[PDB]
Amino acid sequence: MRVNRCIFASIVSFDACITYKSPCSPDAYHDDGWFICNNHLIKRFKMSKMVLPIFDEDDNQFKMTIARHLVGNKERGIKRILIPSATNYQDVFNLNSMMQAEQLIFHLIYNNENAVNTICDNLKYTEGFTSNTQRVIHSVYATTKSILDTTNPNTFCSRVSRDELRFFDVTNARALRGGAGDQLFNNYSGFLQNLIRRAVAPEYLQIDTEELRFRNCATCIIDETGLVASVPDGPELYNPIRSSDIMRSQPNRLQIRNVLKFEGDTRELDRTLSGYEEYPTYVPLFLGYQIINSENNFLRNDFIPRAN
Amino acid sequence: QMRVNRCIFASIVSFDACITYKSPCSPDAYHDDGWFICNNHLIKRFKMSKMVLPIFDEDDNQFKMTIARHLVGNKERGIKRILIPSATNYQDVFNLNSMMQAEQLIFHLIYNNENAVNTICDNLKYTEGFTSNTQRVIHSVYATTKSILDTTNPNTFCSRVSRDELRFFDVTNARALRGGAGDQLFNNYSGFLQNLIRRAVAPEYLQIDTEELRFRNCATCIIDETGLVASVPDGPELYNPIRSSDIMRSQPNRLQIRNVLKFEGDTRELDRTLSGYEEYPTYVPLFLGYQIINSENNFLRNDFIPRANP
Amino acid sequence: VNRCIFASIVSFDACITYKSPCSPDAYHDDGWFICNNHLIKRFKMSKMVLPIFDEDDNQFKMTIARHLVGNKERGIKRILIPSATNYQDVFNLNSMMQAEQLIFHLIYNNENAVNTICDNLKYTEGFTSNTQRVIHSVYATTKSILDTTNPNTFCSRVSRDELRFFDVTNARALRGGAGDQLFNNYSGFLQNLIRRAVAPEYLQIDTEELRFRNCATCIIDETGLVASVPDGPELYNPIRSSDIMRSQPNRLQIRNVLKFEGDTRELDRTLSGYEEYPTYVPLFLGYQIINSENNFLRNDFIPRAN
Amino acid sequence: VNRCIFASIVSFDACITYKSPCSPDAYHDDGWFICNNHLIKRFKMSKMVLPIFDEDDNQFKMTIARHLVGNKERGIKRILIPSATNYQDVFNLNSMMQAEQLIFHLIYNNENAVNTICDNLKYTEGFTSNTQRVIHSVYATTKSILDTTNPNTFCSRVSRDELRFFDVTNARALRGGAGDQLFNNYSGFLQNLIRRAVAPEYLQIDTEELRFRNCATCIIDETGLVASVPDGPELYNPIRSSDIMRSQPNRLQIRNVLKFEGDTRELDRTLSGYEEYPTYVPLFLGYQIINSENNFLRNDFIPRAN
Ligand SMILES: [Zn+2]
Ligand SMILES: [Zn+2]
Ligand SMILES: [Zn+2]
Ligand SMILES: [Zn+2]
């Protein structure tokens, strides 16, 4: 289809004198479970897309989605939040310093209709609203709402794949029961629920009477503040982030940044150890317990909303 | 140069004077990378693979350490999970009285079993062709194995030993420069096996002068009275799908019954939808312990030196 | 002739020869007896000249040094010139070859350690008819320089007109303080090096005060010549790179640099053709009196004794 | 385009014509709105750039000024930027033609003085011919520049990502002392000039303070911006002879200069090789805070308000 499925693809200048670009990277058109491109996922949710190739013992491999968070180990506070909750979202995000269209998209993502109406009224106060700004605002709102219904299981018809269950509190997942984490998860918007399911791979992957443990400890948490990149115990995971993923904005915003460096040649060591299969460090998002029922359609190509 | 085979199991040669034998050591056997075992022999005997763990900083510099992924299935239990058996249970874990001679001699030397290797000599001496080839080949195997072990044994005459590194496997008191039960068991090991554990098992924490770099938030191996084992200090074992094809066929005649796992259903369309994204490997690396680098150190040194604990 | 004190660093083993990296300033007959490269490497200071101008036409330059201590650094990492009772801790002499250790021991008058080095080198084979005369050359050169800067050496002409009080309270009263006592405790070469690196905050010449800075940037406490301000946080002193990277290339060290992000080139061009005010931290402390009749303008080092 | 506020300065009577000797930098959009020549002549300050370096590769420049007040000068001779109350006393407006007086009165918001100058010139029998147009042109240019630098002008951009609290102390976090209110009383152009000339002692970039000087070399008091250290004797500032503008060629000079008698060429040529540490007195005072969200590296000067 070559259709931009990224939710943030509708960003546009509400004023009809400046034309705005479309930095959504190639993956935006790759119709997958994600409804956001890797560039926007990096810039707004501090996550990078990846695939988890689970293998069986003989031939057959199947790949799930996963994300690695880009939170530095030395960060603290609101800087560790990957996906803020509705309460703290307006504080974690600097919505004031963003294009009005992106703010509208964010307000819709968290079901803050009051903010959307405030933006609409503010834009009405301006001149030129009736002719062009109204049309562009309506187009952005329509696209965003359409994506949200696509990812919201509670929409007319909207077939929902209730074959497989997902929890974020393993304390009672094997009992089919949930914790507080999955309650907070249910509080989330459908689009954000799907995004969390895509980004946060389940630490356990019970399939028909078969448990597959992928990690021995979760790397993310679901707390009141939202989906956070803090280990459940001990110092934060060393996550060295370079300027590649950064893709910083505001070329005139002077920002200080404490960055570590390794002093030493390391070239002879690199040459000596080269040729081995490198083990990637990163930090995948592992948390919870996913149950795949005996009867199910789990290799379904087209995305279907998953409701617990 | 790079024409000397550093793998300890390279010397394996049939003691009999007729049947030849060429050990299938991987090319990596020829690199002086601190490993004194090749990747294929590591897989065959210690059930581990050889990987490199690259650690980057925020700037344009990086450095690589060694790490290994064990090849123990989640369903395995008992003495099948043991990667590196201890000096006592090793003869019970390995089936030494099946892998003919030579390799058995190397294994006995690796665990400092003088009596067993002497018994091997006693049995071999009665052969008709002893003073012929047999004695030469046995002596050559012993010499090569002893040289390999001295290269790693820090308590060898004029054996330079690095001491800017401190490695622990107990963590609870590693911040206080003190190890524990796991470290005590580790010290009992042979020098070659101590180096092998240091190479294979990457530290959970890495503390350079003062900055602590945490690589994993939970150890994946353990050092218990039975040795270095691939059991987590938690509930069900990590799902490790053994690549059956990759693992050598060993004995074509021996009939082994293996209950393999099989995923069912078409998955090519899913791969097409998820083709292009960087794949996060599902291997199980060996993470455990705490490694400290003194402010004054020669960590980025090419030549291997035994890293004896202070 | 190389006058850097650290010019004699060699290898006591006969095969490997090591000509210590010395800046071209080593050969100058300036008051310094150390080169800029070695001053940076060991005492973490960079040499500069402070020019003082009259009103119409006459400029005379005094010496000065800027320290290279980051504001974030704390503790024993702030001392530039350690005192003789703590230097073996601040300096990691153990990892400093042997000739450099000998020079450092001589600088601080640690004859015991020098003799220990002597014994250690006598035990080894190939010392008598080889390493001997090499350790001797190192010791002879080091002692020659130290007695050159030591005012008490025999028939050593010593200047006495000019006075230097690192405690400014009673300097106008012709008297030092605790810092000045600690300064007197130092070795002659170290006293000269301090008097060179650390410019005086005040300059009383012909009874005329010429206060240069309004606050000292260093302090002479027990630990030594500390690069610490005696008020509030430390001075922002960014040091970029490529000064001591000669450090053992296999020594893996972590460094917490502080980078600025954003395009500065438009702002740079906006204000480019302006005289730039340097952002280094000079070593200002104390009081210096010229004492009317004197020979301050003499182009040859003479030991200065308070 | 001449941005200097004193650029207009045209003889009100159509007569012998002179152009103000504005320096080349008058044609730079550096945010000074004053040339170095006029800055020196009137506010006894010299322009300079303070480069702040990061640890790796980046450096951003910042404006600064060095005052030209001799240490011996006292009283109203030490004031660089007089307050709106004492300026008619500090400045000899009487001996400043008339266009300079007009500009200065506008700078200090003295519309009464402007009106009396205008009326005195109205009484001229040859007023409406040519003087009215030139007077109005000078007024228009001056008012336009002041509006450019006045944040309260109609729909005028005013950035508030950056906070400049003088007299630091309690002002560190977010406060502002008596000096801060005194500064607030100034005109927008004068506030911009002070903030351009007086670099901040501290610079907290959203978490990280960058102390640039131990003590302030200037102070904001009731008399105005003063070149006086709050620590005792004034800083030695050897203002040379030639660099001073020879405005009045007939005024009797009488100037007590300072001289350094003695040969100094040997020392100069002995130590010429070393990097020189400038002896100018910059203007350090206060505390500048940069918020996490900011446009500080953005050119196209915007008036900054507290
Ligand atoms: Zn996008
Ligand atoms: Zn091998
Ligand atoms: Zn030198
Ligand atoms: Zn001008």
Side-chain angles (χ1 to χ4, degrees), chain A residues 121-150:
Chain A
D121 291 31
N122 223 62
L123 266 292
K124 177 222 82 44
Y125 194 62
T126 88
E127 205 269 21
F129 171 71
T130 52
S131 66
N132 50 25
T133 272
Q134 162 79 57
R135 215 232 172 281
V136 306
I137 283 164
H138 176 274
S139 68
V140 177
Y141 177 99
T143 319
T144 313
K145 212 57 134 50
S146 91
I147 286 167
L148 296 167
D149 325 291
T150 311

XYZ file of all heavy atoms in Angstrom, chain A residues 121-150:
239
model
N -10.239 25.911 19.665
C -10.748 27.248 19.954
C -9.667 28.302 19.765
O -9.920 29.368 19.186
C -11.304 27.299 21.377
C -12.571 26.487 21.533
O -12.717 25.473 20.821
O -13.423 26.863 22.365
N -8.454 28.024 20.240
C -7.358 28.969 20.066
C -7.116 29.238 18.590
O -6.906 30.384 18.180
C -6.093 28.427 20.732
C -5.341 29.489 21.503
O -5.861 30.066 22.459
N -4.106 29.756 21.092
N -7.148 28.186 17.771
C -6.929 28.368 16.341
C -8.090 29.118 15.699
O -7.892 29.883 14.748
C -6.717 27.013 15.669
C -5.251 26.597 15.513
C -4.520 27.486 14.516
C -4.545 26.616 16.860
N -9.307 28.913 16.204
C -10.452 29.677 15.715
C -10.276 31.162 16.003
O -10.636 32.010 15.178
C -11.739 29.149 16.351
C -13.006 29.905 15.966
C -13.918 30.130 17.173
C -13.497 31.328 18.021
N -13.133 32.537 17.229
N -9.726 31.495 17.172
C -9.499 32.899 17.509
C -8.647 33.592 16.452
O -8.766 34.807 16.247
C -8.837 33.003 18.882
C -8.858 34.393 19.478
C -10.056 35.033 19.767
C -7.674 35.065 19.757
C -10.074 36.304 20.313
C -7.680 36.333 20.302
C -8.882 36.948 20.580
O -8.887 38.213 21.124
N -7.784 32.843 15.772
C -6.887 33.440 14.792
C -7.612 33.719 13.480
O -8.667 33.150 13.189
C -5.688 32.528 14.527
O -6.007 31.607 13.474
C -5.288 31.762 15.784
N -7.031 34.617 12.690
C -7.528 34.883 11.349
C -7.136 33.751 10.407
O -6.170 33.022 10.643
C -6.972 36.211 10.834
C -7.818 36.883 9.763
C -7.417 36.482 8.357
O -6.790 35.415 8.195
O -7.727 37.237 7.410
N -7.900 33.609 9.326
C -7.641 32.575 8.349
C -8.050 31.183 8.772
O -7.733 30.221 8.062
N -8.740 31.041 9.905
C -9.154 29.721 10.365
C -10.120 29.073 9.381
O -10.001 27.885 9.064
C -9.797 29.832 11.747
C -10.456 28.566 12.212
C -9.698 27.467 12.568
C -11.834 28.479 12.300
C -10.298 26.302 12.996
C -12.441 27.315 12.731
C -11.672 26.226 13.079
N -11.077 29.849 8.876
C -12.203 29.263 8.158
C -11.766 28.596 6.860
O -12.314 27.556 6.475
C -13.252 30.337 7.875
O -12.630 31.455 7.232
C -13.900 30.798 9.170
N -10.780 29.169 6.171
C -10.468 28.746 4.808
C -9.556 27.520 4.766
O -9.940 26.472 4.238
C -9.823 29.907 4.046
O -8.558 30.232 4.594
N -8.350 27.636 5.321
C -7.318 26.612 5.184
C -6.998 25.913 6.498
O -6.918 24.678 6.548
C -6.044 27.245 4.615
C -5.637 28.497 5.364
O -5.981 28.671 6.533
N -4.911 29.382 4.691
N -6.799 26.687 7.566
C -6.425 26.100 8.846
C -7.478 25.108 9.320
O -7.147 24.057 9.877
C -6.204 27.209 9.877
O -4.846 27.658 9.814
C -6.490 26.719 11.282
N -8.757 25.424 9.110
C -9.811 24.485 9.476
C -9.642 23.171 8.727
O -9.741 22.088 9.314
C -11.181 25.109 9.190
C -12.352 24.129 9.097
C -12.855 23.698 10.459
O -13.231 24.530 11.284
N -12.864 22.394 10.702
N -9.378 23.247 7.423
C -9.252 22.034 6.623
C -8.076 21.189 7.092
O -8.197 19.969 7.257
C -9.099 22.401 5.145
C -9.752 21.421 4.184
C -8.779 20.956 3.113
N -9.334 19.885 2.295
C -9.394 18.611 2.658
N -8.950 18.204 3.836
N -9.916 17.720 1.817
N -6.924 21.824 7.324
C -5.749 21.057 7.729
C -5.953 20.458 9.118
O -5.600 19.297 9.364
C -4.478 21.926 7.661
C -4.329 22.539 6.278
C -4.494 23.004 8.726
N -6.525 21.232 10.046
C -6.761 20.719 11.390
C -7.712 19.533 11.339
O -7.500 18.518 12.015
C -7.305 21.834 12.302
C -6.173 22.766 12.730
C -7.977 21.243 13.530
C -6.650 24.078 13.302
N -8.778 19.642 10.544
C -9.724 18.541 10.438
C -9.066 17.310 9.832
O -9.334 16.186 10.261
C -10.935 18.963 9.609
C -11.915 17.858 9.372
N -11.793 16.967 8.328
C -13.031 17.497 10.048
C -12.794 16.106 8.369
N -13.560 16.405 9.403
N -8.205 17.498 8.828
C -7.518 16.352 8.240
C -6.634 15.656 9.266
O -6.640 14.422 9.373
C -6.687 16.797 7.038
O -5.597 17.603 7.448
N -5.871 16.435 10.037
C -5.007 15.848 11.059
C -5.840 15.090 12.084
O -5.525 13.951 12.453
C -4.150 16.937 11.728
C -3.309 16.343 12.845
C -3.256 17.605 10.704
N -6.917 15.717 12.562
C -7.754 15.083 13.573
C -8.385 13.806 13.036
O -8.460 12.797 13.744
C -8.827 16.065 14.041
C -9.811 15.499 15.039
C -9.662 15.740 16.397
C -10.894 14.736 14.626
C -10.555 15.232 17.311
C -11.791 14.224 15.534
C -11.619 14.477 16.875
O -12.513 13.968 17.784
N -8.847 13.832 11.786
C -9.470 12.653 11.200
C -8.475 11.510 11.091
O -8.781 10.370 11.454
C -10.047 12.993 9.827
N -7.269 11.796 10.596
C -6.265 10.745 10.470
C -5.913 10.162 11.834
O -5.848 8.935 12.006
C -5.017 11.298 9.785
O -5.404 12.166 8.712
C -4.164 10.166 9.239
N -5.692 11.030 12.823
C -5.321 10.551 14.150
C -6.431 9.699 14.750
O -6.179 8.610 15.280
C -5.003 11.735 15.061
O -4.133 12.645 14.378
C -4.337 11.260 16.342
N -7.673 10.176 14.666
C -8.783 9.424 15.230
C -8.964 8.098 14.510
O -9.286 7.086 15.139
C -10.065 10.255 15.168
C -11.043 10.002 16.308
C -10.414 10.249 17.673
C -11.317 11.079 18.573
N -12.714 10.557 18.650
N -8.763 8.076 13.189
C -8.883 6.827 12.445
C -7.847 5.816 12.908
O -8.165 4.639 13.109
C -8.737 7.088 10.948
O -7.386 6.962 10.544
N -6.601 6.256 13.091
C -5.581 5.343 13.599
C -5.966 4.840 14.986
O -5.823 3.649 15.299
C -4.201 6.026 13.606
C -3.657 6.123 12.182
C -3.234 5.256 14.490
C -2.466 7.035 12.043
N -6.465 5.737 15.839
C -6.831 5.330 17.191
C -7.954 4.299 17.177
O -7.912 3.322 17.934
C -7.225 6.550 18.020
C -6.097 7.556 18.245
C -6.647 8.863 18.788
C -5.044 6.983 19.176
N -8.971 4.492 16.333
C -10.014 3.474 16.225
C -9.433 2.169 15.705
O -9.801 1.086 16.174
C -11.173 3.919 15.325
C -11.472 5.399 15.412
O -11.968 5.852 16.467
O -11.283 6.100 14.395
N -8.526 2.250 14.731
C -7.863 1.046 14.248
C -7.237 0.276 15.399
O -7.325 -0.955 15.455
C -6.797 1.406 13.214
O -7.353 2.297 12.241
C -6.286 0.159 12.523
